[PDB]
Paper text:
The anaphase-promoting complex/cyclosome ([name]/C) is a large multimeric cullin-RING E3 ubiquitin ligase that functions to regulate cell cycle transitions by ubiquitinating specific cell cycle regulatory proteins and targeting them for proteolysis by the ubiquitin-proteasome system. Only four subunits are directly involved in catalyzing protein ubiquitination (the cullin subunit Apc2 and the RING subunit Apc11) and degron recognition [coactivator subunits (either Cdc20 or Cdh1) and Apc10]. The remaining 85% of the [name]/C mass corresponds to scaffolding subunits, of which seven are large multiple repeat motif proteins (Apc1 and Apc3–Apc8). Seeking to obtain insights into these structures at atomic resolution and to assist in the interpretation of cryo-EM reconstructions of the [name]/C complex, we determined the crystal structures of full-length [name] and the N-terminal domain of [name] (Apc5N).
We first determined the crystal structure of [name] [name] (residues 1–741 that lacked the C-terminal 48 residues that were predicted to be disordered). The protein was overexpressed in the insect cell/baculovirus system and the structure was determined using phases to 3.2 Å resolution derived from multiwavelength anomalous diffraction. [name] adopts a bi-domain architecture, dominated by a 360-residue seven-bladed WD40 β-propeller domain (Apc4WD40) split by the HBD (Apc4HBD) predominantly composed of four long α-helices. Apc4HBD is inserted between strands C and D of blade 4 of the WD40 domain, extending away from the wider lower surface of the β-propeller such that, together, the HBD and WD40 domain generate an L-shaped molecule. To our knowledge, the insertion of a helical bundle domain within a WD40 β-propeller domain is novel. Human and [name] [name] are also very similar, differing only for residues 120–130 ([name] [name] numbering) within the shorter WD40 insert that is an α-helix in the [name] [name] structure in contrast to a predominantly disordered loop structure in human [name].
Residue numbers in the entry: 2 to 280, 309 to 416, 443 to 452, 511 to 614, 628 to 740
Amino acid sequence: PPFRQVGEKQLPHEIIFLAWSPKRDLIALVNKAGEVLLHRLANIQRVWSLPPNENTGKEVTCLAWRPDGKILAFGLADTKKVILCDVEKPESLHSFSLETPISCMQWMEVNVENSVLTSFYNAEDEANVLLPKLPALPKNYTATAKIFSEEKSDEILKLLGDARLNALVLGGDSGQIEIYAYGMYKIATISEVYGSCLRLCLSSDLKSLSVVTELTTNNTPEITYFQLDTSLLSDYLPEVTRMARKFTHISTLLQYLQLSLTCMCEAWEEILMQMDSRLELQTLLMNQLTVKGLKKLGQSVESSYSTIQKLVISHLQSGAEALLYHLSELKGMALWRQKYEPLGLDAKAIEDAITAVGSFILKAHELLQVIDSGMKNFKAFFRWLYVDFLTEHFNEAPEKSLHFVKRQMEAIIDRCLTKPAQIIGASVQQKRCLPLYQVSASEEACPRLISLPYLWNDKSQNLHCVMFRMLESSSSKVFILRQPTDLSRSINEALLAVTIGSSYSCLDARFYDEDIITVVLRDNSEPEGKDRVLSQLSLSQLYSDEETEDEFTWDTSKRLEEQHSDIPTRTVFLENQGRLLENMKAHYVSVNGIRKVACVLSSNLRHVRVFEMD
């Protein structure tokens, strides 16, 4: 009676990751076969299926929904790469390699939109609408993915989302963390934890980065909570936002320049292959090649030259011009020092990079001069065989350091991009480390990324929250640890053990709306034990110091499991005692607060039951 059944489907293969789209009623899931599939809310209809291929990663470990729900990113542990693809088309729009194999993923965006941040968004929105679009790259067989192909609305304006800073944070099996702005610019590489990145959470204010890690040991892994001080990204937020944005533009270009140079080099290889296939003398020439065959070779060489000329006079000229534009502005920012210097922006490094772009466009101009001088001799040769002219006929019978200038250019651009990631990564300190518990024999049954502990941001009160199960201490109790984003702040009820009731045992719990959490429970009745409902977190927090104690009395050098005896116990009550029950063996949920949707995955059976909370 409380919630409405929308669909019920038995998935062919087991599911290792479940996630809802933040803006649409779509659910992304990993199929344990390494395939990622999309499903609609109504009757859980399969939208698409992305097969796992050896070419672009086989083992996919996690997913991430971009706040602007048009782009979906997923990490591959085997090939050590993150591939960003559209939600409508299976095709990948972007890809990048990672230092360590992926463990977990998070795609978040800043909740702060104060004064100068608003002035920046408006400026970037007006910059992109004013600056002329780059010339359309021709549809070539050598051109892979074809993002710059220009068909209706371009994918480059989709890849680069809103000016509002969104970060894609990646976790490793070693504990290494990587933060990618707009899901493409590396802001920080953090290596301050010990286990394998189980859960990741960057705060909306960018003050802290909480992480839950599963440390592998001889008998059973040890679940440990950590909190990192990423406050530099908070203090210099409008600068970090603008800085990363210009780097995503310089990353889009250079790649555009390389792809256009690839199309230019391939068109040159098409002339040399056709020339090699073509080339007493009077009889042999007319027998080897017909008079009709010279005409088809004439157009093929003329069309390839025109495209080569267009690629360097239009694509390369506008490409380098836009590169000179975005770098020149980055220097103007870099010249502040008070701002951008403690962020790692070196004016001299980019100044030298401008000259590198200038030397490249000039060397490309010098390369065209060689092609034009070579084509004028061929023009006199072609017209002579059909019917200044005689001189060019005699003279008739990568290169010119272009590979060197492109490498020197991308070398200085990369030094401009790498310096901030090194110094921002140096600024972040490990301020909190809380060993929780050691995994039980039963917890090793379900996948890492579906089960509890559950890390969430709580953007309303700015609190890093964790809901975990310590089975060795208690079988029916759910533990809730909440720490503020600003570490200097002292929180009231830092840790509690909530007994949920009756409904007794809590299997899975997930954040839904402002103060309420969705919860899957195990009732006293034996036939139908599995039942889902929403719980109000307001009942336990108490927001007042009890006997001048904020539960800071526990030893953070010893596991919290060891000191469970003196933990502050609480008893929470449900909105409906017997809300929605199901004949299936539930155990897990995936929810979306604003879209009022839910996805109940069955324990091991991988049968899914969807319900709308509206």
